[PDB]
Every structure is written in structure tokens, then in C-alpha cells.
Amino acid sequence: AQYEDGKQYTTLEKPVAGAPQVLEFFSFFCPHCYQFEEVLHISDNVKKKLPEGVKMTKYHVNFMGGDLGKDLTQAWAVAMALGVEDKVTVPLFEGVQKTQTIRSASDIRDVFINAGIKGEEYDAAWNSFVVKSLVAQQEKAAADVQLRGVPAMFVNGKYQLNPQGMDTSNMDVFVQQYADTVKYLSEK
């Protein structure tokens, strides 16, 4: 066929019931994730081609960057609870990977403050049980597909994107191929 198991995607041996439609995993320590966000705008180009009535979910993972990696998973829960994902994503990536000015939870917090989230609102969120279970959701979703690598995208808890098998001579062509693949899997 034109789309084949094991080529633009792989199938989960052990499917995950009730999973979000389009589920994406990343880490602010993950270099391809930086590319995916900053250079390729993957999430965004996927959305533009997805049917709608379709929700997109994006979660942070713990297995990179040790103690800071976890701080970052909790910060992303904060960002989700407050709905400020689109104001912190870029400065978090660049603070971890470009400028290397993020070294502690306090530095993560500074990014939110500079993006205009209020100190008190951030600290309340950070410490809230609504952020605790949000952290729990992220870990559970990662657990459910036994995740050892990012970036990763899963469709309907059944199919996992396989970017290794898409041409990378042209970045635009890669993105379209990637997004079209998600759409195809979405309709499967």
C-alpha cells in the first residue's frame, strides 16, 4: 500500500482504551522536540489537517533531565491548568536548550512570570491538587504506551507515528508527510 505498518507508523501490540485522539509526548530537554516546536511546527500543521471534532493533547515526560525533567512535567501541568501553553513553550525550550538559563524550579517559574502569569497565581497552581492529578494524567498516559522515546505521537491509542521513515531532505515535505500520516491514521 502507500501507508504501511512499520513504515510511516507502527502499531501497538497492546492498544490503549479511552486514549486521547491525537496524543503527543515531548520533553523540553529533547532536541528533536525543539525542532518539532520551533522549526517544523508539527503540532500546528497536524491540527490544520485534522478533521474536526478532534481534540489534540500534548504531554511532558519525566525520563529526560532527571530532577529538572520532573519539575518541567509539573510546570507543564501548570501551563495546562492555566491555559498558557502558547506563552511558555518557546521560552522554556530556549531556556533549557539555547541559553541554558534554566537550572532550577525557580528559573522555570521566572519564565512564567516574564510571560505575565502572576506570581501568586503560579505558586497556587504549582501547589494545587488540580496540578497533582494533571501530573498524574501525563505520567499515566506515558506509562500506558510504555514510552522510552520522544518526540512521540499516538493516534487513538493504537498507532504510533514513525518519523524515521519519512524523507528529511526537505523540512516542509517532512511536515506534510507527517501531518497527512496523522490524518490517514485518524480516519482508519
mmCIF file of C-alpha atoms in Angstrom:
data_model
loop_
_atom_site.group_PDB
_atom_site.id
_atom_site.type_symbol
_atom_site.label_atom_id
_atom_site.label_comp_id
_atom_site.label_asym_id
_atom_site.label_seq_id
_atom_site.Cartn_x
_atom_site.Cartn_y
_atom_site.Cartn_z
ATOM 1 C CA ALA A 1 0.000 0.000 0.000
ATOM 2 C CA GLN A 2 1.034 3.635 0.228
ATOM 3 C CA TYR A 3 0.739 3.682 4.018
ATOM 4 C CA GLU A 4 2.210 0.575 5.667
ATOM 5 C CA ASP A 5 2.564 -0.670 9.209
ATOM 6 C CA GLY A 6 6.228 -0.376 10.099
ATOM 7 C CA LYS A 7 6.947 2.380 7.594
ATOM 8 C CA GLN A 8 5.211 5.708 8.360
ATOM 9 C CA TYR A 9 3.843 4.239 11.559
ATOM 10 C CA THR A 10 3.929 1.192 13.836
ATOM 11 C CA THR A 11 1.002 -0.445 15.606
ATOM 12 C CA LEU A 12 0.697 -1.049 19.315
ATOM 13 C CA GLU A 13 0.660 -4.727 20.182
ATOM 14 C CA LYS A 14 -1.162 -3.601 23.281
ATOM 15 C CA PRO A 15 -3.758 -0.931 22.385
ATOM 16 C CA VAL A 16 -4.806 1.675 24.923
ATOM 17 C CA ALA A 17 -8.536 2.115 25.530
ATOM 18 C CA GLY A 18 -10.062 5.551 26.083
ATOM 19 C CA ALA A 19 -6.861 7.332 24.997
ATOM 20 C CA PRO A 20 -6.956 10.880 23.559
ATOM 21 C CA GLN A 21 -7.452 11.026 19.789
ATOM 22 C CA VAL A 22 -4.154 12.706 18.974
ATOM 23 C CA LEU A 23 -1.673 12.266 21.800
ATOM 24 C CA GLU A 24 1.770 13.853 21.648
ATOM 25 C CA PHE A 25 4.742 13.475 24.062
ATOM 26 C CA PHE A 26 7.721 15.759 24.418
ATOM 27 C CA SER A 27 10.467 16.955 26.728
ATOM 28 C CA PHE A 28 11.979 20.419 26.945
ATOM 29 C CA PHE A 29 15.344 18.572 27.086
ATOM 30 C CA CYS A 30 14.613 16.744 23.815
ATOM 31 C CA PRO A 31 16.442 18.247 20.801
ATOM 32 C CA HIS A 32 14.135 16.859 18.111
ATOM 33 C CA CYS A 33 11.256 18.184 20.223
ATOM 34 C CA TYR A 34 12.804 21.634 19.967
ATOM 35 C CA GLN A 35 12.983 21.229 16.201
ATOM 36 C CA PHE A 36 9.353 19.947 16.172
ATOM 37 C CA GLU A 37 8.170 23.021 18.027
ATOM 38 C CA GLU A 38 10.472 25.802 16.783
ATOM 39 C CA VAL A 39 11.424 24.828 13.251
ATOM 40 C CA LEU A 40 8.741 22.448 11.988
ATOM 41 C CA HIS A 41 5.640 23.489 13.984
ATOM 42 C CA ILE A 42 4.435 19.862 13.805
ATOM 43 C CA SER A 43 1.595 20.128 16.300
ATOM 44 C CA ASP A 44 0.287 23.058 14.457
ATOM 45 C CA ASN A 45 0.427 21.596 10.978
ATOM 46 C CA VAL A 46 -1.208 18.423 12.211
ATOM 47 C CA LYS A 47 -4.128 20.441 13.651
ATOM 48 C CA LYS A 48 -4.567 22.252 10.330
ATOM 49 C CA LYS A 49 -5.155 18.930 8.585
ATOM 50 C CA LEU A 50 -7.059 17.033 11.243
ATOM 51 C CA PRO A 51 -10.785 16.546 10.716
ATOM 52 C CA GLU A 52 -12.583 18.318 13.400
ATOM 53 C CA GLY A 53 -14.450 17.234 16.334
ATOM 54 C CA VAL A 54 -10.873 16.066 17.022
ATOM 55 C CA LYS A 55 -9.028 17.010 20.222
ATOM 56 C CA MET A 56 -5.213 17.272 20.406
ATOM 57 C CA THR A 57 -3.330 16.517 23.589
ATOM 58 C CA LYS A 58 0.305 17.208 24.444
ATOM 59 C CA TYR A 59 2.125 15.879 27.494
ATOM 60 C CA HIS A 60 5.597 16.330 29.018
ATOM 61 C CA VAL A 61 7.694 13.345 30.141
ATOM 62 C CA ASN A 62 9.992 12.668 33.107
ATOM 63 C CA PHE A 63 12.690 10.407 31.693
ATOM 64 C CA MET A 64 14.940 13.235 30.484
ATOM 65 C CA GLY A 65 16.829 15.719 32.647
ATOM 66 C CA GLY A 66 16.360 13.978 35.983
ATOM 67 C CA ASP A 67 15.104 16.308 38.724
ATOM 68 C CA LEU A 68 14.541 19.242 36.397
ATOM 69 C CA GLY A 69 12.740 16.965 33.966
ATOM 70 C CA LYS A 70 10.151 16.315 36.664
ATOM 71 C CA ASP A 71 9.950 19.999 37.586
ATOM 72 C CA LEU A 72 9.216 20.575 33.947
ATOM 73 C CA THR A 73 6.446 17.995 33.906
ATOM 74 C CA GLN A 74 4.871 19.759 36.856
ATOM 75 C CA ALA A 75 5.353 23.190 35.135
ATOM 76 C CA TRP A 76 3.657 21.928 32.022
ATOM 77 C CA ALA A 77 0.725 20.771 34.199
ATOM 78 C CA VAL A 78 0.627 24.383 35.482
ATOM 79 C CA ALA A 79 0.753 25.696 31.943
ATOM 80 C CA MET A 80 -2.177 23.389 31.010
ATOM 81 C CA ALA A 81 -4.289 24.262 34.056
ATOM 82 C CA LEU A 82 -3.864 27.990 33.376
ATOM 83 C CA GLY A 83 -4.171 27.602 29.629
ATOM 84 C CA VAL A 84 -0.889 29.371 28.958
ATOM 85 C CA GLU A 85 0.858 26.686 26.907
ATOM 86 C CA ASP A 86 1.332 29.047 23.996
ATOM 87 C CA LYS A 87 3.182 31.626 26.071
ATOM 88 C CA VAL A 88 5.712 29.423 27.818
ATOM 89 C CA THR A 89 6.568 26.732 25.312
ATOM 90 C CA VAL A 90 9.086 28.721 23.338
ATOM 91 C CA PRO A 91 10.905 30.367 26.311
ATOM 92 C CA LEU A 92 11.046 27.021 28.131
ATOM 93 C CA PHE A 93 12.668 25.364 25.117
ATOM 94 C CA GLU A 94 15.192 28.147 24.662
ATOM 95 C CA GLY A 95 15.924 28.452 28.374
ATOM 96 C CA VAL A 96 16.696 24.731 28.565
ATOM 97 C CA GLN A 97 18.445 24.191 25.215
ATOM 98 C CA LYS A 98 19.564 27.550 23.743
ATOM 99 C CA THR A 99 20.538 29.969 26.509
ATOM 100 C CA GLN A 100 20.831 27.380 29.268
ATOM 101 C CA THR A 101 19.387 29.747 31.834
ATOM 102 C CA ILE A 102 17.017 27.181 33.266
ATOM 103 C CA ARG A 103 18.685 25.240 36.056
ATOM 104 C CA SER A 104 16.116 25.147 38.855
ATOM 105 C CA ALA A 105 12.400 25.250 39.537
ATOM 106 C CA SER A 106 12.876 28.923 40.315
ATOM 107 C CA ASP A 107 14.209 29.563 36.830
ATOM 108 C CA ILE A 108 11.195 27.731 35.322
ATOM 109 C CA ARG A 109 8.947 29.973 37.395
ATOM 110 C CA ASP A 110 10.774 33.102 36.067
ATOM 111 C CA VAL A 111 9.728 32.142 32.525
ATOM 112 C CA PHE A 112 6.079 32.128 33.604
ATOM 113 C CA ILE A 113 6.485 35.469 35.465
ATOM 114 C CA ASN A 114 8.087 37.081 32.452
ATOM 115 C CA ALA A 115 5.269 35.725 30.289
ATOM 116 C CA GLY A 116 2.922 37.609 32.565
ATOM 117 C CA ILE A 117 1.421 34.889 34.747
ATOM 118 C CA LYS A 118 1.179 36.290 38.267
ATOM 119 C CA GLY A 119 3.494 35.059 40.983
ATOM 120 C CA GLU A 120 0.715 34.119 43.314
ATOM 121 C CA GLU A 121 -1.341 32.525 40.546
ATOM 122 C CA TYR A 122 1.669 30.425 39.524
ATOM 123 C CA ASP A 123 2.547 29.318 43.086
ATOM 124 C CA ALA A 124 -1.111 28.437 43.853
ATOM 125 C CA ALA A 125 -1.362 26.413 40.620
ATOM 126 C CA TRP A 126 2.038 24.794 41.227
ATOM 127 C CA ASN A 127 0.849 23.574 44.622
ATOM 128 C CA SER A 128 -2.708 22.669 43.652
ATOM 129 C CA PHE A 129 -4.200 19.143 43.625
ATOM 130 C CA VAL A 130 -5.648 20.059 40.237
ATOM 131 C CA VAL A 131 -1.972 20.232 39.138
ATOM 132 C CA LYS A 132 -1.131 16.936 41.006
ATOM 133 C CA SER A 133 -3.670 14.817 39.061
ATOM 134 C CA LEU A 134 -2.692 16.675 35.856
ATOM 135 C CA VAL A 135 0.884 15.466 36.537
ATOM 136 C CA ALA A 136 -0.707 12.049 37.173
ATOM 137 C CA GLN A 137 -2.504 12.069 33.807
ATOM 138 C CA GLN A 138 0.758 12.843 31.996
ATOM 139 C CA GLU A 139 2.648 10.030 33.657
ATOM 140 C CA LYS A 140 -0.229 7.578 33.201
ATOM 141 C CA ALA A 141 -0.560 8.274 29.500
ATOM 142 C CA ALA A 142 3.203 7.797 29.098
ATOM 143 C CA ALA A 143 3.037 4.605 31.143
ATOM 144 C CA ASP A 144 0.128 3.190 29.116
ATOM 145 C CA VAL A 145 2.232 3.031 25.919
ATOM 146 C CA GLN A 146 5.452 2.176 27.753
ATOM 147 C CA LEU A 147 7.235 5.269 26.468
ATOM 148 C CA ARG A 148 11.035 5.325 26.182
ATOM 149 C CA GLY A 149 11.357 7.972 23.493
ATOM 150 C CA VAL A 150 10.224 11.444 22.496
ATOM 151 C CA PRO A 151 9.039 13.118 20.364
ATOM 152 C CA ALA A 152 6.191 10.675 20.016
ATOM 153 C CA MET A 153 2.680 10.869 18.702
ATOM 154 C CA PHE A 154 -0.057 8.260 19.148
ATOM 155 C CA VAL A 155 -3.358 8.138 17.306
ATOM 156 C CA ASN A 156 -6.476 6.695 19.008
ATOM 157 C CA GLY A 157 -4.198 4.819 21.382
ATOM 158 C CA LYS A 158 -3.442 2.410 18.577
ATOM 159 C CA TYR A 159 -0.935 3.840 16.102
ATOM 160 C CA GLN A 160 2.412 5.472 16.703
ATOM 161 C CA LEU A 161 3.979 7.853 14.213
ATOM 162 C CA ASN A 162 7.225 6.686 12.720
ATOM 163 C CA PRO A 163 9.215 9.712 11.535
ATOM 164 C CA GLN A 164 12.387 7.625 10.915
ATOM 165 C CA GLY A 165 10.667 6.507 7.715
ATOM 166 C CA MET A 166 9.846 9.847 6.051
ATOM 167 C CA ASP A 167 12.162 11.848 3.735
ATOM 168 C CA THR A 168 14.186 14.550 5.537
ATOM 169 C CA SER A 169 15.802 16.255 2.555
ATOM 170 C CA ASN A 170 13.111 18.941 2.716
ATOM 171 C CA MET A 171 11.622 20.082 6.023
ATOM 172 C CA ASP A 172 8.287 21.251 4.556
ATOM 173 C CA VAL A 173 7.803 17.921 2.785
ATOM 174 C CA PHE A 174 8.568 16.048 6.009
ATOM 175 C CA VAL A 175 5.931 18.001 7.950
ATOM 176 C CA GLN A 176 3.231 17.492 5.314
ATOM 177 C CA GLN A 177 4.038 13.793 5.172
ATOM 178 C CA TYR A 178 3.843 13.642 8.918
ATOM 179 C CA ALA A 179 0.549 15.534 9.100
ATOM 180 C CA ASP A 180 -1.026 13.553 6.236
ATOM 181 C CA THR A 181 0.001 10.407 8.070
ATOM 182 C CA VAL A 182 -1.772 11.531 11.212
ATOM 183 C CA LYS A 183 -4.877 12.353 9.140
ATOM 184 C CA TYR A 184 -4.825 8.919 7.481
ATOM 185 C CA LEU A 185 -4.451 7.185 10.851
ATOM 186 C CA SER A 186 -7.173 9.385 12.233
ATOM 187 C CA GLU A 187 -9.581 8.087 9.564
ATOM 188 C CA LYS A 188 -8.503 4.469 9.921
#
